[PDB]
Amino acid sequence: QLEHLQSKYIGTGHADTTKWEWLVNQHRDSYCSYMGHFDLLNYFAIAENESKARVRFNLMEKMLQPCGPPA
């Protein structure tokens, strides 16, 4: 009966979790990992003629509601 650690974690699905929740969790994890990794953030800031601060600001705003509105 060691399911306490399963329930006490945020970001994992369960029996009747739909596709939208899984995809938004994936997008949030991807954004957080992008922010954590310096090399990928530098690559993104090199790809576009912008600054790292602006890139991370826009990425933070993208965390509000990814994958459109819920259905």
Binding residues vs another protein (CB under 8 A):
1-2, 4-6, 8-15, 17, 19-20, 23-24, 26-30, 32-40, 42-44, 46-54, 57, 60-61, 63-71
Q: How far is the CB of 56 from another protein (least distance, A)?
A: 9
Whole-number Å distance between alpha carbons of 33 and 40: 9
Q: How far is the CB of 11 from another protein (least distance, A)?
A: 6
Q: Which of 63, 54, 64, 55 is nearest to 28 (CA)?
A: 63
Q: First and final CA of the chain: distance in angstroms?
A: 34
Q: How far is the CB of 55 from another protein (least distance, A)?
A: 10
